Write a protein that binds this DNA or RNA. Structure first.
Ligand SMILES: [Mg+2]
Ligand SMILES: [Zn+2]
Lengths: 79, 147, 141, 22, 178, 510, 129, 80, 178, 55
RNA sequence: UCCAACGGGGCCUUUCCUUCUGGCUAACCAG
């Protein structure tokens, strides 16, 4: 037994994105700092493209099946 | 207790005082039997609110994972009350410390709809949506009987 | 609930409840419109434009950020497709399959898929003719 | 971006192709 | 296209007729007043407001002795749906317009008709339709309730002996559950 | 409670103190939601009025004084102020308590909310208006400094005006020793020439000092103000570092000084008067307005001067007042004051012919015909057109005929959008005055001269473009292209930072 | 595919009542669903229900107390005269005054008794008893 | 340099900006007498201005908590 | 800068003048925030009461400038609330409604006003509870970004929304027991 | 702290005023009802409590 | 003089510019 109207926050965190009471994305955005250049670029967590630093054309992330893998040496922060 | 919990006097046709924590409605309420100025209510938001008439104000509020259907105060311990809950359980509470329960009664297989103390205060009886009545000793977490 | 298949997948995007731009987004709406125009001029489709903006510029949704869809923004600037994007890709997939069938006439599987693809073009081509998006005389190949 | 670009998607692109056709 | 502009012609007709002999007045006034009240059947709100102002001015020119004729004519022409709400809005407007000219006990003759309109539009079926959330309309006669104001106009004019006309429907309402 | 109040107020019988103590026990807790306790306040007013002595009434006084300053409803503050004031003035209290009560009032004068400060000043005013001289003497110095603070620096203009009014009604009632402390502070603030802020404080407080105790009560303080005024007005040039606030303050206090005494018209004060004439064109508009008012009294009282204004100086003033009108944006009040001065100067020139009004008329016409700052020039044009109507009335019949062409020429275009409509209506009024002043024949002779002059020049200009085209078609074409380029720039619609679309020429600046 | 969301809501409520569930979740919601549930609530068949907005068709959570014997939709929504109402109440309800037939009339969605009282008619939405 | 219109309106002395902002302490200290200062006895001491009232829901929250402490004391009498 | 510059209305009210004065004072005090405070300017002010007794300042602003106003809102609002204590400051964009405006546009602009009100926090959700008797409770669920601030302003938000839209709404912050 | 202290001063004040003994005080009035010894003792207590507040 | 209800009258929520559809060549006919 569970309260459908008032579900526990932990219980909702376990559910599928579309199966919650109000459905919304589980993705997010990051502030990724370039290694060689130190400029900050906004990157989507599940980015489907190899995001490049505009100043350097330096690869920041690599697309994968789900979340994009951030290039080693690139610092990040959740935006 | 309806959309708002109201206090009435027999000799007045409009409610004498308006008690309410907020906008949420009140599903049940039970006066205390010894400290007669203390009142408890149940809300549709799975909450238990305590009131005191001497201050004409609500005092404490705790929210539970599921709704509580009935409340009964212990006729022999003014600070103890039991709650009939929708998670198959009845919970025994101390008024002064509501962060935990004194005991849990665990035998029903459907929502517990009503609960009552024996006037000696040593037993409680619970009615359930599963078509049974169970009797518990206040000190033990399983029923001694099912009717 | 796939058409032309037995698949029952439900994978999709989940639009957030909030319709407003993120508080952390601090870029002018005019600069986003200009970026959409440059990408379209290089020849990207509206779907691919949204991917680049969302992946590299923080544009969660163009409508949420600018107030207008990418489709409507480009048309305001003279950039519009000859045929709708979804119909465009269906025709190209039919062309690649038909080209493959010219060399490989024993590929009965590819012969089967071309029937499914072409039937998907007729259903979509029929729809656009009703809404007047496509001229009434338009017929596929 | 270059590999993802379409030569014939926009009306101006087909017009440009129409221009060189004649 | 010109109906709103021509309505005040009815006010001109009442003036010239009232100068005639009494036999002619009885022969021309009922035709003139009846014809105005039929324009209230119109589904145009702007035309219905143009009719209403002309009825108000004619009511001043006439006395309260003609008020009973007008109200009974109004009840005959407006009988179904939104027409019921137009009836009470127009009845209040005539009473509101005639507020200065009216003398004490002028509304005694028409008191019974007014209270039936007032009570029906507060507690009757018309009153319920005004309170219905499902009832989406832009007509101002229906969204606006003027029964309370009409009750104040009436109580200022009624002779105290007939003041039981107002209280009786109240008592009948109070006997039933409320 | 309302009935209980009327029971006590009127009926001879009264309730027990024990019964009264219980009721006040019920009222005190509920009293912190005063919005629905109005009738209870009337009950409390009854108890203090009969001076019934209860211990709980002293707690009521402590609660009801804070409600006076914190509550938002005006009615509750009004009734809570009355009950508190009567309690303070009537009920027995220890001297230690009284100082604390008055300590509360001074500190509450710095309450954040403006309505709170205004309510306090009602209570301050009650003490000032009705209190023992001994009590006022104890509290004169404290109120003055606290009130002067609010008047000097406060967000609410109403509070500053109220603070000045309280000081104005407070100083006359002070004892000589108490007033003598006030004189030190105003003197001390003026002495602080190093700090500009202290100067504004001294100059503004000196204004309140006049009209309350008057001029010449203490000569030393008066002399300090003039030295500060002389020091400020002398350094009004570009190199000067004085702020527009300090210049405006000096002109305010001088204007009040000017009313107080006629010594301003002596030769000693001429240096200040020259500085005032300089400020007519000071960069700030408010300084111009205050300078304009001073010059108006100077011109109206030119006979009072020991050294009468030389006609050259009067004519220089007229040039500067005309230059004021030509400024981009001018208020209603500056325009009205300026034309009153120029009319007064015109009377002198008319009565005594000055060979250096025809000069005034041409300058007025120049302003009416100017196209600079079209978007904001309505007020300058209004003043000029109204000024001409006034000049016609003063000027003699023979004199207007000589200058009739100059008057009627600029207004002809108007005689042939609500702002434009207003200007055309004013011009018609001016023509009616000209018609009444003159006869039928002289008026029509002047009207024909302007009509032919305006119509002749238009057709003459139309020809010159034709000869310009024929002789130099290419240069005429070039001039034509520049004209269309200019129009397109003015015609274009542009958006503001707020997405507000307007045509280029509609854009308004000063 | 989905044809009647009201039918789905009523079927889900019936199954929840069948299996002894104290609450039921309905997706999608509608104006018609809310009016049907409000009639049910006014007649005491259901208790509190709460509407959840997701910027889409929506959801509803209904509290159940065991007081619903049956609810159903009548599809298609046949046109009903004033005279026909009796016939329908005869065909859908186990007894004469046991339960209500729910109609959508020109004056809104209401039970058949109120439709007679207001003298209105229209199409039939369903029944509850 | 440029003409400062300061809007298009009559000059008001009460709107005139003041000032570093001068506190009341600065004004009373300028006297430098120490016998005039003590006459302003009400102006020396801890600030006595009232705190602005809090929002009622926040006030009720503290009222509810205070009421709860009292009620616990009343029922703890039954403990013996 | 004069206060009249900040005010788009030709005839500013006294409250408008005071708040614009606070604006220009903040601009002058700031070394560099002025660079973004100066372009910003507002259309009007409305001081509206709250159930608790205090008041709220609704600052009506142009739609395009609302982005910059939002960019500076936290600092600007804290400064103004310091300047105007016992008053809650909120920035709302002024959105066109006239075609008698149509109901769908009213609903859209009311929603947008709600999102403007809740700022900086965001609306997690909305719910309607239908009680047995027929009452309806409309509830708006807010996120917990700045809970300590908005907790003091929830009643102000309710009062403002009721005053502007004429709807009763309850703001709740889930994940906390208030 | 000020508002927490202010809250405590209320519910103490309301709690005292609700006390049953306080209800006994209001049962008489009009300076005509019999003055009981307990009331006279309170009248003495009111005197010193009054003195404290003047000071 | 202020406040709260209830009644009236005038305004406002619309800066300026472009922008209905269909025939035939910015016109001209139709809706
Ligand atoms: Mg697929
Ligand atoms: Zn880089």
């Amino acid at each position: 037994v569970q309260d459908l109207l008032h579900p526990t926050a932990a219980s909702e965190a376990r559910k599928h994105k579309l199966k919650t009471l109000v459905q919304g994305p589980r993705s997010y955005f990051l502030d990724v700092k370039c290694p060689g250049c130190l400029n900050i670029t906004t990157v989507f967590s599940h980015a489907q493209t190899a995001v490049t630093c505009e100043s350097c054309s330096t690869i920041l992330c690599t697309p994968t099946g789900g979340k994009a893998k951030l290039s080693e040496g690139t610092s990040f922060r959740r935006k | 207790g309806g959309a708002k919990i109201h206090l009435w006097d027999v000799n007045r046709l409009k409610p004498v005082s308006d008690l309410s924590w907020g906008a949420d409605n009140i599903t049940s309420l039970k006066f205390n039997q010894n400290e007669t100025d203390i009142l408890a209510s149940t809300g549709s938001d799975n909450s238990i609110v305590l009131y005191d008439l001497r201050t004409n104000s609500p005092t404490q509020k705790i929210v539970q994972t599921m709704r509580t259907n009935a409340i009964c105060w212990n006729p022999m311990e003014a600070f103890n009350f039991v709650t009939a809950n929708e998670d198959h359980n009845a919970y025994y509470y101390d008024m002064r410390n509501l962060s935990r329960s004194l005991n849990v009664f665990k035998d029903h297989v459907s929502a517990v709809m009503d609960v009552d103390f024996s006037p000696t205060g040593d037993e409680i009886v619970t009615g359930s949506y599963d078509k049974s009545i169970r009797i518990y000793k206040t000190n033990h977490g399983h029923s001694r009987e099912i009717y | 609930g796939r058409m032309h298949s037995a698949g029952k997948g439900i994978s999709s995007s989940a639009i957030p409840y909030s319709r407003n731009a993120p508080a952390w987004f601090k870029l002018s709406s005019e600069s986003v419109i200009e970026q959409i125009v440059k990408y379209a001029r290089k020849g990207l489709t509206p779907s691919q434009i949204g991917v680049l903006l969302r992946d590299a510029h923080g544009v969660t949704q163009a409508r949420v950020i600018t107030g207008n869809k990418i489709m409507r923004i480009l048309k305001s600037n003279g950039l519009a497709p000859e045929i709708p994007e979804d119909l465009y890709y269906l025709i190209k997939k039919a062309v690649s399959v038909r080209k493959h069938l010219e060399r490989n006439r024993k590929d009965k599987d590819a012969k089967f898929r071309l029937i499914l693809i072409e039937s998907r073009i007729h259903r979509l081509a029929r729809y656009y003719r009703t809404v007047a998006v496509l001229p009434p005389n338009w017929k596929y190949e | 971006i270059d590999k993802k670009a379409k030569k014939d998607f926009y009306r101006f692109q087909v017009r440009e192709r129409k221009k060189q056709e004649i | 296209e010109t109906i709103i502009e021509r309505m005040p012609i009815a006010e001109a007709l009442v003036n010239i007729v009232l100068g005639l002999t009494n036999d002619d007045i009885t022969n021309f006034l009922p035709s003139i007043l009846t014809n105005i009240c039929q324009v209230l059947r119109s589904k145009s709100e702007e035309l219905r407001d143009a009719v209403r102002v002309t009825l108000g001015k004619i009511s001043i020119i006439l006395g309260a002795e003609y008020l009973v004729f007008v109200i009974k004519e109004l009840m005959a022409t407006l009988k179904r749906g939104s027409q019921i709400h137009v009836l009470s809005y127009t009845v209040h407007y005539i009473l509101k317009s005639m507020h200065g000219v009216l003398k004490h006990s002028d509304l005694d003759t028409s008191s019974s008709m007014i209270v039936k309109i007032i009570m029906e539009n507060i507690f009757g079926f018309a009153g319920e339709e005004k309170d219905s959330e499902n009832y989406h309309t832009k007509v101002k006669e229906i969204k606006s309730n003027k029964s309370y104001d009409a009750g104040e106009i009436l109580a200022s004019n009624i002779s105290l002996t007939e003041f039981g006309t107002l209280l009786s429907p109240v008592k009948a309402l109070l006997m039933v559950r409320i | 409670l309302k009935f209980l109040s009327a029971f006590i107020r009127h009926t001879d019988s009264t309730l027990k103190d024990t019964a009264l103590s219980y009721v006040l026990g019920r009222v005190l807790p509920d009293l912190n939601e005063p919005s629905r306790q109005g009738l209870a306040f009337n009950f409390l007013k009854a108890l203090v009025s009969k001076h019934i002595m209860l211990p709980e009434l002293y707690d009521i006084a402590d609660t009801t004084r804070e409600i006076m300053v914190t509550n938002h409803s005006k009615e509750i503050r009004d009734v809570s102020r009355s009950v508190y004031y009567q309690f303070l003035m009537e009920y027995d209290q220890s001297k230690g308590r009284l100082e604390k009560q008055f300590k509360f009032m001074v500190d509450n004068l710095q309450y954040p909310t403006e309505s709170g400060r205004q309510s306090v000043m009602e209570l301050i005013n009650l003490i000032i208006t009705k209190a023992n001289p001994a009590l006022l003497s104890k509290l004169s110095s404290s109120f003055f400094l606290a009130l002067v603070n609010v008047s000097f620096n406060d967000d609410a203009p109403r509070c500053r005006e109220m603070a000045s009014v309280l000081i104005s009604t407070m100083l006359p009632k002070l004892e000589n020793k108490d007033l003598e402390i006030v004189e030190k502070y105003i003197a001390a603030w003026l002495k602080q020439v190093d700090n500009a802020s202290f100067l504004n404080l001294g100059l503004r407080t000196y204004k309140v000092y006049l009209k309350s105790i008057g001029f010449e009560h203490t000569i030393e303080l008066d002399e300090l103000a003039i030295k500060r005024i002389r020091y400020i007005l002398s350094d009004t040039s570009v190199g000067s570092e004085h702020q527009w606030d300090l210049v405006y303050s000096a002109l305010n206090t001088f204007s009040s000084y000017m009313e107080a005494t006629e010594s301003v018209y002596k030769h000693g004060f001429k240096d200040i008067w020259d500085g005032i004439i300089t400020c007519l064109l000071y960069p700030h508009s408010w300084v111009r307005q205050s300078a304009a008012n001073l010059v108006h009294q100077l011109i109206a009282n030119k006979d009072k001067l020991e050294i009468s204004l030389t006609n050259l100086e009067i004519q220089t003033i007229a040039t500067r007042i005309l230059h004021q009108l030509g400024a981009p944006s001018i208020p209603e009040n500056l325009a009205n004051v300026s034309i009153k001065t120029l009319v007064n100067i015109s009377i002198l020139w008319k009565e005594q012919r000055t060979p250096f009004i025809d000069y005034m008329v041409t300058r007025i016409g120049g302003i009416i015909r100017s196209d600079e700052h079209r978007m904001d020039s309505f007020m300058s044009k209004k003043a000029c057109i109204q000024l001409l109507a006034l000049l016609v009335q003063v000027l003699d019949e023979d004199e207007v005929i000589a200058e009739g062409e100059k008057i009627l020429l600029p207004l002809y275009g108007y005689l042939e959008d609500e702002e434009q409509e207003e200007l055309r209506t004013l011009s018609n009024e001016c023509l009616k005055i000209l018609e009444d002043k003159l006869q039928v024949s002289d008026f029509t002779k002047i009207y024909t001269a302007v009509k032919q002059t305006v119509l002749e020049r238009r057709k003459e200009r139309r020809s010159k473009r034709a000869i310009l085209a024929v002789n130099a078609p290419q240069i005429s074409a070039d001039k034509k292209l520049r004209k269309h380029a200019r129009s397109r720039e003015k015609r274009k619609h542009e958006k503001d930072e707020n997405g507000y679309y307007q045509r280029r020429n509609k854009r308004k600046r000063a | 595919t989905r044809s009647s969301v009201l039918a789905d809501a009523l079927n889900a409520i019936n199954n929840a009542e069948k299996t002894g569930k104290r609450q039921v979740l309905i997706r999608p919601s509608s104006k018609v669903i809310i009016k049907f549930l409000q009639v049910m609530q006014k007649h005491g068949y259901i208790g509190e229900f709460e509407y959840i907005d997701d910027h889409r068709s929506g959801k509803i959570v209904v509290q159940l107390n065991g007081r619903l014997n049956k609810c159903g939709v009548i599809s298609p929504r046949f046109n009903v005269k004033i005279g026909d109402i009796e016939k329908w109440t005869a065909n859908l309800l186990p007894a004469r005054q046991f339960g209500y037939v729910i109609l959508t009339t020109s004056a809104g969605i209401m039970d058949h008794e109120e439709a007679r009282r207001k003298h209105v008619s229209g199409k039939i939405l369903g029944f509850v008893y | 340099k440029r003409l400062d219109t300061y809007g298009s309106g009559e000059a008001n002395e009460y709107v005139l900006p003041s000032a570093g902002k001068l506190s009341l302490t600065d004004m009373m200290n300028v006297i430098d007498d120490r016998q005039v200062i003590e006459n302003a006895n009400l102006l020396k001491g801890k600030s006595s201005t009232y705190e602005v009232p809090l929002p009622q829901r926040i006030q009720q929250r503290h009222d509810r908590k205070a009421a709860y402490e009292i009620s616990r004391q009343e029922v703890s009498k039954w403990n013996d | 800068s004069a206060p009249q510059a900040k005010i788009l209305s030709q005839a500013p009210t006294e409250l408008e003048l005071q708040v614009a004065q606070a604006f220009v004072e903040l601009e002058n005090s700031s070394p560099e925030l002025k660079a973004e405070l100066r372009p910003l300017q507002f259309k009007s002010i409305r001081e509206i009461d709250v159930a608790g007794g205090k008041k709220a300042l609704a600052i009506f602003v142009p739609v395009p400038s609302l982005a910059g106003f939002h960019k500076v809102q936290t600092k600007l609002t804290r400064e103004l609330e310091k300047k105007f204590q016992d008053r809650h400051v909120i920035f709302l964009a002024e959105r066109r409604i006239l075609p008698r405006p149509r109901s769908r546009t009213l609903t859209a602009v009311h929603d947008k006003i709600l999102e403007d009100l809740v700022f900086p926090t965001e609306i997690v959700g909305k719910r309607v509870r239908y009680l047995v008797g027929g009452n309806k409770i409309q509830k708006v669920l807010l996120d917990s970004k700045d809970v300590q601030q908005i907790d003091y302003k929830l009643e102000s938000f309710q009062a403002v929304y009721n005053k502007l839209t004429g709807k009763q709404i309850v703001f709740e912050i889930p994940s906390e027991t208030h | 702290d000020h508002d927490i202290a202010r809250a405590k001063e209320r519910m103490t004040l309301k709690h005292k005023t609700n006390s049953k003994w306080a209800k006994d005080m209001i049962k008489h009035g009009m300076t005509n009802d019999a003055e009981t010894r307990e009331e006279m003792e309170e009248m003495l207590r009111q005197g010193e409590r009054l003195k404290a507040k003047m000071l």
